[PDB]
């Protein structure tokens, strides 16, 4: 009952359904004057040590990085006042999905005071608007968590390897606005069964979802590069993350030099 | 913005904000309007509210219409119904509520339900106040500023949860989780009180609570409830009540609702029915959609 057996085949085809009604323009990047995929990348690695700080779930940085996509899709912003649209995203966030979310005042606080409370309040409203209030989205995590229950048996450094590579994928938009969550979801799961215990994609999983290591081919290419030069990344702070036993030293496994496909 | 609406009448108020009854000018529909109170910006509860209702559109469950933000008022546009169930079943204390008119509510309440549990809503705070009724015989699930989004599986979400009366004994004894299971419980307790019109379970504590839910239905040990004996408020200094014959907790009940009122009510969360099931029952072999007798 806490894998609802009743519902989650109509909650799974519910959320593939809206998947598509919340996603990012995927050319938003160029049509932006003043940003780019480089300053977008500083500001998502801020924001996964927030919610490392202020102990945050995981699903909390993801919708985050989903209302800052959408916003920035229809709204031209300046490089001065990203990290504002920032600080109102992941505010929202945690107010949509926390038990005890952070107070207004120590999101001014880790601003550095580059902002008031005011301006984060204000912001907040002009997210609110834009987005006409639709902030229950799919995420990443919410087909991770479903692929999980199809291991013979659970694996524990599976999972949280799988969080890792998809965590990993919020940072660069080239190329992952192209991808839809279910997509490098699937992904995700296929190279961490792989690189740990050497078993593929399963057929209970072509059944649930209709994706073949065919379909997910292009997204797996680009992972795989992803997790190899993830050493080598200006940003590092989802690396610091998962150094941390709480997800298993997952990002100290050594990643696979082929895969096979 | 409000310049469509005029206020007829304040109809109820409380920690949430005030509700009136209004009517658009140029159209001549009657809303209610919820005006929610205005510290730490938008409220979460306002937040949760109104994006899960936008997503939900069903029959039995309250239609949002609009949302008006002036950046100093929030009101939300609603379909008018005229009363809750607890007034309702207050103003029929004189010899109570006929049985197809109990089926016909708690069948409309299941198929709520089911469309909130299939688009991963949970409710969290079911009760009489909280469902309302119209002139043309229909029921629906109001009040969404408890509810939330769930994952599959779940995690741990929020303790202080549902109403005590009719707050699920997971919930009670400190489980790590919950589900689906505990939005059950709640209709349950409602079934009951619609049939007998006073609430089934009237605890004045947690302890009382739980005490007074045992006397009824047993206390449950390992062979009724795996694991039940290893949760976090679980005393072993609990007294050791034996169970109830259903026949004597709701007498006038015949069978078939007997049957679908212990599946609502069985203890272990991975054993109680499930809304989309209940709809099969035996007990809505004969369900018709009759209008409010009064
Ligand atoms: C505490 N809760 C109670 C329910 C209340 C609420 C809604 O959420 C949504 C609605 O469409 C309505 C409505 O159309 C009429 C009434 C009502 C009827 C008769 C008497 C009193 C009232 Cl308030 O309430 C509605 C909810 O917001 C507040």
Redesign the pocket.
Same mark, same amino acid.
């Given at each position: 009952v806490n894998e609802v057996p009743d519902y989650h085949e109509d909650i799974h085809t519910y959320l593939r359904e809206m998947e598509v009604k919340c996603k990012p323009k995927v050319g938003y990047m160029k049509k932006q004057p003043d940003i780019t995929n480089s300053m977008r990348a500083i500001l998502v690695d801020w924001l996964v040590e927030v919610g490392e700080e202020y102990k945050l779930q995981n699903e909390t940085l993801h919708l985050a990085v989903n209302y800052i996509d959408r916003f920035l899709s229809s709204m031209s912003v300046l490089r001065g006042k990203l990290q504002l649209v920032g600080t109102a995203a992941m505010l929202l966030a945690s107010k949509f999905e926390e038990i005890y979310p952070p107070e207004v005042a120590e999101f001014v606080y880790i601003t550095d005071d580059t902002y008031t409370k005011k301006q984060v309040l204000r912001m907040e409203h002009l997210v609110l608007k834009v987005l006409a209030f639709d902030l229950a989205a799919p995420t990443i995590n919410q087909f991770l968590t479903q692929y999980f229950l199809h291991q013979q048996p659970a694996n524990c450094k599976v999972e949280s390897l799988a969080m890792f590579l998809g965590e990993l994928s919020l940072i660069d938009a080239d190329p992952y606005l192209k991808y839809l969550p279910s997509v490098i979801a699937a992904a995700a799961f296929h190279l961490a069964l792989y690189t740990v215990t050497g078993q593929s994609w399963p057929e209970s999983l072509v059944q649930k979802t209709g994706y073949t290591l065919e379909t997910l081919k292009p997204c797996l290419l680009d992972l795989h590069q992803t997790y190899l030069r993830a050493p080598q990344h200006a940003q590092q702070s989802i690396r610091e993350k998962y150094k941390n036993s709480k997800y298993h030293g997952v990002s100290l496994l050594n990643p696979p030099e082929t895969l096979n496909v | 913005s409000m310049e469509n609406f005029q206020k007829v009448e304040k109809?109820?108020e409380?920690t949430?904000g005030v509700?009136y *009854?209004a009517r658009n000018k140029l159209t001549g529909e009657v809303? +209610?309007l919820?005006k929610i109170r205005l510290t730490e910006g938008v409220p979460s509860t306002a937040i949760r509210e109104i994006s899960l209702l936008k997503e939900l559109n069903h029959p039995n469950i309250? *239609?949002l219409l609009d949302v008006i933000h002036t950046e100093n008022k929030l009101y939300?546009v609603?379909?008018?119904?005229?009363?809750?169930l607890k *007034?309702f079943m207050d103003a029929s204390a004189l010899t109570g509520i006929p049985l197809p008119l109990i089926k016909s509510y708690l069948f409309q309440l299941l198929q709520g339900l089911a469309f909130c549990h299939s688009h991963r809503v949970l409710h969290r705070d079911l009760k009489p106040?909280?469902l309302?009724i119209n002139t043309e015989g229909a029921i *629906?699930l +109001?009040?969404?500023?408890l509810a939330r989004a769930f994952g599959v599986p779940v995690r741990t979400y929020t303790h202080e949860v549902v109403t005590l009366w009719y707050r699920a004994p997971e919930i009670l004894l400190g489980c790590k989780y919950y589900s689906t299971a505990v939005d059950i419980w709640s209709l349950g307790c409602i079934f009951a009180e619609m049939v007998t019109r006073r609430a089934l379970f009237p605890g004045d504590s947690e302890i009382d609570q739980l005490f007074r839910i045992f006397r009824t239905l047993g206390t449950p040990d390992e062979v009724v409830w795996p694991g039940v004996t290893s949760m976090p408020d679980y005393k072993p200094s609990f007294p050791k009540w034996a169970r109830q014959d259903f026949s004597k907790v709701v007498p006038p009940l015949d069978e078939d609702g007997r049957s679908l009122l212990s599946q609502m009510l069985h203890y272990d969360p991975n054993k109680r029915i499930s809304a989309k099931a209940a709809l099969a029952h035996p007990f809505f072999q004969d369900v018709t959609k009759p209008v409010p007798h009064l």
């Open positions: - | 109809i109820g409380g949430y509700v *009854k809303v +209610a919820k309250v *239609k939300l609603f379909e008018f119904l005229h009363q809750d *007034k106040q909280n309302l *629906k +109001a009040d969404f500023g």
